Ligand binder design. Structure first.
Ligand SMILES: CCC[C@H]1Cc2c(C)c3c(n2-c2cc(Cl)c(C(N)=O)cc2O1)CC(C)(C)CC3=O
Length: 208
């Protein structure tokens, strides 16, 4: 079964701003997704200290960047804490609402789109380069889910029947036709070096 949900008004407004505002510095989407992966990895690592059984779903703490020119996708994989069904549907959208209001107020005041991460809504910067975003996630206390949205005010959540992940999150970016530069090895390496050189987890850039 595929469940369809409406984004809260502020999130739909945020997504429309990201998709419609003329802003050439699109490359910042990668640092935002890597930062979310790094934060998710910090969470599981901290949780594992009081409960070692939380790493029974995988001991390796890493980030993989997987470009696919045939499917026109850039996948960001992490072995972080993952997200529950409640996180995908309600929890994160609720925390994102306040961050969204503050960000849109800052943009009106003179701030730029690159500052999105300071408002904890950096995940939505994925819509700078992607026409559709698929999020495959597995949290220790829940099942594997697939979240998906092409914006337009709605998202879907379904139980994932694909390849089991153990634990973590896969962000599949279905790139816009004119954003294929983010599938190029040299381009991804340049972006990682410029904005994510001090991330405390190994970042492996897969090759085609
Ligand atoms: C609590 C701060 C971190 C948030 C930030 C965040 C927000 C805010 C939202 C999402 N994320 C988010 C994304 C990813 Cl891909 C990861 C990860 N790699 O584990 C962790 C995330 O949680 C994804 C969403 C639930 C589909 C929509 C949303 O509003």
């Amino acid at each position: 079964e595929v469940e369809t949900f409406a984004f809260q008004a502020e999130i739909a407004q945020l997504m429309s701003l990201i998709i419609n505002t003329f802003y050439s510095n699109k490359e910042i989407f990668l640092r935002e997704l890597i930062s979310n992966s790094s934060d998710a990895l910090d969470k599981i690592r901290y949780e594992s200290l009081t409960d070692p059984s939380k790493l029974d779903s995988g001991k390796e703490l890493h980030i993989n960047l997987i470009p696919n020119k045939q499917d026109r996708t850039l996948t960001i994989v992490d072995t972080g804490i993952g997200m529950t069904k409640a996180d995908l549907i309600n929890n994160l959208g609720t925390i994102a609402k306040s961050g969204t209001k503050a960000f849109m107020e800052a943009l009106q005041a003179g701030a730029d789109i690159s500052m999105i991460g300071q408002f904890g809504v950096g995940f939505y910067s994925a819509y700078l380069v992607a026409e559709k975003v698929t999020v495959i996630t597995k949290h220790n206390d829940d099942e594997q889910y697939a979240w998906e949205s092409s914006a337009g005010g709605s998202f879907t959540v379904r139980t994932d029947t694909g390849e089991p992940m153990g634990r973590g999150t896969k962000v599949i970016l279905h790139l816009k036709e004119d954003q294929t530069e983010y599938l190029e090895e040299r381009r991804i390496k340049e972006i990682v070096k410029k904005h994510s050189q001090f991330i405390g987890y190994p970042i492996t850039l897969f090759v085609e």
